[PDB]
Nucleic acid binder design. Structure first.
Lengths: 150, 150
DNA sequence: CCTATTGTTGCAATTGCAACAATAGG
DNA sequence: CCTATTGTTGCAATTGCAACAATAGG
């Protein structure tokens, strides 16, 4: 069985570090861009749903989202039928940053996917989607506190 | 073209968070285990070379390597020919941790590579190798300070 | 002498395990 | 009432852009 955890970890460290440095121009912090991007596509969704689809810690997302709302990029309004859910909507400062973030994310994507044909990227989109699903259960299994057996 | 950066970010966050909590029992910090894995297999390596292979910040490294030596997990040695380079070697408690660490990583890799035939993982190893190489230039590009033009 | 390497700290922010809250929804 | 959901703070870290120092190797 050949390792894959290493390269995927390397590739993510680079792409995230590039995005952090480039987005510091737009005053976005270390990991704050992954939230607003997802919040802009799915308007009004909840911390717990983002925590699930993004696979980050809940407390880490809580304070990181507190700044995006403090610094005026998103707004957390509540629903009349739910006293606990906080529906996270983007502001006009956030709606204008989304087309720019898509360009850095897409240009970094084109640099990373340089050399692949249209069929090769789909074979890689499917392979990564499968790996993302295979690891989803064990992430919450360890996140809850349960001990793995190996 | 389709997007690949998003899934790669999710997979690397989950695999890292799983490894962090499970290596917390072995008194390794938030991201310290990635260094010791490489130092054990590359004895006499320098901190700068690790920064290049792992694609993490140089300041993030140096501060983290300090704890690795401060907590007796590795050792910083000086050479005769070079008063600038610090050849990094693991301690004895560092060597005994290596077969355990590549046992959790090995199993996390098997969970991630679930349902792939032996050929499908090679088509994935070779694919991720290019993506790692394709992004190698642009990361040091931005890290050094030069602005990127789309 | 000169420039790229190799390596460290000053703030200042993020990160995340506990540990604790409070509603949802039976 | 009960339990899963959803959420925030306490606090001790790591993390990272500046701003530095110091030898390597011409």
């Amino acid at each position: 069985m050949k390792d894959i955890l290493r390269d995927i970890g390397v590739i993510a460290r680079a792409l995230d570090s590039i995005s952090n440095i480039e987005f510091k121009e737009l005053n976005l912090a270390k990991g704050q861009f992954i939230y607003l991007v997802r919040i802009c596509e799915n308007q009004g969704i909840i911390q717990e749903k983002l925590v699930d689809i993004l696979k980050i810690d809940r407390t880490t997302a809580s304070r990181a989202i507190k700044n995006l709302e403090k610094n005026g990029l998103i707004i957390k309004k509540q629903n009349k039928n739910n006293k606990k859910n906080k529906l996270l909507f983007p502001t006009e400062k956030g709606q204008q940053l989304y087309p720019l973030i898509i360009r850095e994310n897409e240009y970094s994507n084109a640099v990373a996917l340089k050399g692949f044909t249209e069929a090769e990227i789909n074979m890689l989109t499917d392979a990564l989607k499968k790996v993302k699903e295979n690891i989803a259960d064990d992430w919450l299994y360890v996140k809850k506190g349960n001990k793995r057996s190996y």
